[PDB]
Amino acid sequence: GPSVFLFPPKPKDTLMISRTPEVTCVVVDVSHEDPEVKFNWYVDGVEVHNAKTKPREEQYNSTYRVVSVLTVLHQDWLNGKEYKCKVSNKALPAPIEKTISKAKGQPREPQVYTLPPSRDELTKNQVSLWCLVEGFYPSDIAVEWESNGQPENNYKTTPPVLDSDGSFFLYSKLTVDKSRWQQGNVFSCSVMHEALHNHYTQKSLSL
Amino acid sequence: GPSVFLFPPKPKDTLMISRTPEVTCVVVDVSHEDPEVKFNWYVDGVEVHNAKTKPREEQYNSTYRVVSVLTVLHQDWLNGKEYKCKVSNKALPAPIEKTISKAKGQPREPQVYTLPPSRDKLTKNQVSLSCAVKGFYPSDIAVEWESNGQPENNYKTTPPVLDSDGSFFLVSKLTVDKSRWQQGNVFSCSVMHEALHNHYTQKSLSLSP
Ligand SMILES: *[C@@H]1O[C@H](CO[C@@H]2O[C@@H](C)[C@@H](O)[C@@H](O)[C@@H]2O)[C@@H](O[C@@H]2O[C@H](CO)[C@@H](O[C@@H]3O[C@H](CO[C@H]4O[C@H](CO)[C@@H](O)[C@H](O)[C@@H]4O[C@@H]4O[C@H](CO)[C@@H](O[C@@H]5O[C@H](CO)[C@H](O)[C@H](O)[C@H]5O)[C@H](O)[C@H]4NC(C)=O)[C@@H](O)[C@H](O[C@H]4O[C@H](CO)[C@@H](O)[C@H](O)[C@@H]4O)[C@@H]3O)[C@H](O)[C@H]2NC(C)=O)[C@H](O)[C@H]1NC(C)=O
Ligand SMILES: *[C@@H]1O[C@H](CO[C@@H]2O[C@@H](C)[C@@H](O)[C@@H](O)[C@@H]2O)[C@@H](O[C@@H]2O[C@H](CO)[C@@H](O[C@@H]3O[C@H](CO[C@H]4O[C@H](CO)[C@@H](O)[C@H](O)[C@@H]4O[C@@H]4O[C@H](CO)[C@@H](O[C@@H]5O[C@H](CO)[C@H](O)[C@H](O)[C@H]5O)[C@H](O)[C@H]4NC(C)=O)[C@@H](O)[C@H](O[C@H]4O[C@H](CO)[C@@H](O)[C@H](O)[C@@H]4O)[C@@H]3O)[C@H](O)[C@H]2NC(C)=O)[C@H](O)[C@H]1NC(C)=O
């Protein structure tokens, strides 16, 4: 029978009020013999009716893939409400039920520190700027770099690491031309997390 | 029927001549009816005879577990030789073969940088010292901290992260009581990797007035 996978919104979508967070229910292996899928959606066990189900679409293993998308309210997600997808198909013994919610646990505020390049490194032609983010919980987070209001996207960020106190830390490494650094340009690490005021902080770094 | 799991040596063990790297071939779900198990070991397809095999040990699920350990030459592992464990048992249709070797790819030398605490952290009680290791390949690496001739307990290291140029980086975070940092104590990040001279390099950090 078919399989169902339920996916959360993007952290940045739940944290920025301008954005629209979505929960996504994906049904795979819908065979031709029975192509019809019914989605029932529930928030905290109360059924809701505003999900939008997409035109089911045929895959190369020649079976079907069906997707329903439910817009969530930012504060519902952040307040820990549970989102249940129920998938009904002729070919199932019983309907499939998947439930998802925000990672549980007492929130803890990220501490954000920018670290300049090592001396050592001032001899190649690029330098590494570092954004250390530590002490946060849960691990859902968004970390971005910019300069003069523009995204600097030539960076890589480690996954969150569980630290000895049960909080998480990570490191974002931004690589820039050494000339940009030596000439005094200002670079900024932006962090978005539920435990921050306005879900947002920015820390800047320059020579 | 029985199942076989073949485990590699730890990276540090292959990089330090004083340590003993081993490949471990583990057989589980050996029956009471057919308890005999034979190991044959091959290095690049050439049979070798010096493995040390343990007596079978019964588990709480009434099956046996049997382990054979092959000591490997550091340089054989680092030169990419293939280690094959072949397991024979009368309950099996044919012997089970498993093969393992070091991760492949052109080695690249890690660059190691220590990063002092942010000033923002100095009013916190504990400060975080950073050891950034970048540009290395393959991802097998060991990173350790010490001070004053003893290891430091209180550090965590990120997994290797694939960078935009195809190499890996990571960072190691050592948390210390702020007094010890202000004290002037020297802390040292040691990195062990196949592409380092002597498979080892160390960088140190202490408060700069
Ligand atoms: C027939 O084919 C289909 C499809 O095959 C694929 O497509 C074809 C064309 C070829 O390219 C194939 O090579 C492909 O495989 C097969 O369907 C697959 O079935 C698998 C099960 O057998 C299933 O495995 C499970 O995957 C989960 C993760 O899936 C993620 O991530 C992968 C990437 O690694 C990706 O392929 C999936 O699409 C899915 O991606 C996420 O999608 C969601 C939904 O859109 C995204 O979230 C939304 O995104 C939007 C913006 O896009 C917005 O942000 C919304 O707000 C947000 O909600 C999300 O961003 C995507 N993430 C990523 C990373 O891409 C696993 O988690 C799961 O693990 C389970 O088991 C684990 C241990 O085993 C457990 O620990 C764990 O808890 C889980 O329980 C499974 O491994 C594949 O996902 C599925 N592929 C697709 C495309 O649906 C089908 O099986 C095959 N049939 C046969 C008979 O072979
Ligand atoms: C009957 O019982 C046996 C025994 O189990 C015990 O007794 C039972 C009754 C219960 O009480 C259990 O709770 C007990 O543990 C069962 O045997 C198990 O069978 C499993 C398969 O069915 C098998 O699963 C596979 O596990 C692999 C990981 O094994 C690691 O890690 C686990 C911990 O997570 C650990 O328990 C294992 O012992 C093994 O530990 C590693 O050992 C190696 C070798 O010693 C270590 O490497 C050496 O270390 C030294 C120094 O320490 C030196 O560095 C050497 O250089 C080096 O070689 C290594 O450090 C250890 N690692 C860790 C983390 O400790 C998985 O990889 C594997 O996954 C793969 O295959 C899967 C499919 O099976 C895939 O899904 C997957 O993707 C992978 O491809 C399996 O999950 C168990 O290991 C095995 N347990 C033991 C103890 O052998 C038996 O199943 C059961 N039968 C029945 C019918 O019920």
> Which contiguous run of DSSP H or E holds residue A38?
strand A38-43
B92 with B132, same domain: the answer is no
A186 with A117, same domain: the answer is yes
CB atoms A173 and B118 under 8 Å: no
Q: State the residue range of the domain holding B148.
A: 102-209
- Write the CA distances from B48 to A195, A196, B25, B36, integer angstroms: 59, 60, 14, 20
The neighbour count for residue A148, using CB atoms within 10 Å, is: 9
Number of domains present in the structure of chain A: 2
Give every CB contact of residue B120 below 8 A, 6+ residues apart in sequence. A111, A113
Largest CA distance in chain B: 73
Last residue of a domain, one of B58, B79, B101: B101
Resolution in A: 1.6
B135 with B193, same domain: the answer is yes
**Alpha carbon distance A142, A139 (integer Å):** 10
B184 with B208, same domain: the answer is yes
B66 with B107, same domain: the answer is no
Tokens of A18: 């301008």
A202 with A106, same domain: the answer is yes
Last residue of a domain, one of B101, B126, B158: B101
Answer whether B110's CB lies under 8 Å from B134's CB: yes
Answer whether A158's CB lies under 8 Å from B161's CB: yes
Q: Which one, of A132, A129, A194, lies nearest residue A163 by Cα?
A: A132
Last residue of a domain, one of B70, B101, B132: B101
B28 with B94, same domain: the answer is yes
B119 with B209, same domain: the answer is yes
B112 with B147, same domain: the answer is yes
CB atoms A159 and B161 under 8 Å: yes
The separation between CA B111 and the C-alpha centre of its own chain, rounded to angstroms, equals: 19
B190 with B177, same domain: the answer is yes
Cα torsion angle, B192, B195, B197, B201, sign: negative
Q: Measured in angstroms, how far is the CA atom of residue A6 from the centroid of ligand 1?
A: 10
Q: Which residues of B touch A166 (CB under 8 A)?
A: none
The neighbour count for residue B159, using CB atoms within 10 Å, is: 10
φ/ψ of A127, rounded to 5, equals -125, 160
Strand-pair partners of B39: B87
Nearest CA distance, B128 vs chain A (angstrom): 10
Residue nearest to atom 25 of ligand 2 (CA): B5
A70 with A90, same domain: the answer is yes
Please give the method by which this entry was determined. Answer: X-ray
Answer whether B111's CB lies under 8 Å from A121's CB: yes
Residue nearest to atom 19 of ligand 2 (CA): B28
B4 with B79, same domain: the answer is yes
The separation between CA A99 and the C-alpha centre of its own chain, rounded to angstroms, equals: 17
CB atoms B121 and A113 under 8 Å: yes
Nearest CA distance, A24 vs chain B (angstrom): 28
Q: Measured in angstroms, how far is the CA atom of residue B7 from the centroid of ligand 2?
A: 10
Radius of gyration of chain A (CA): 22
- Ligand having the closest approach to the CA of B70: 2
The 3-state secondary structure of chain B, one letter per residue: CCEEEEECCCHHHHHCCCCCCEEEEEEEEECCCCCCCEEEEEECCEEECCCEECCCEECCCCCEEEEEEEECCHHHHHCCCCEEEEEECCCCCCCEEEEECCCCCCCECCEEEEECCCHHHCCCCEEEEEEEEEEEECCCCEEEEEECCEECCCEEECCCEECCCCCEEEEEEEEEEHHHHHCCCCEEEEEECCCCHHHCEEEEECCCC
CB atoms B118 and A120 under 8 Å: no
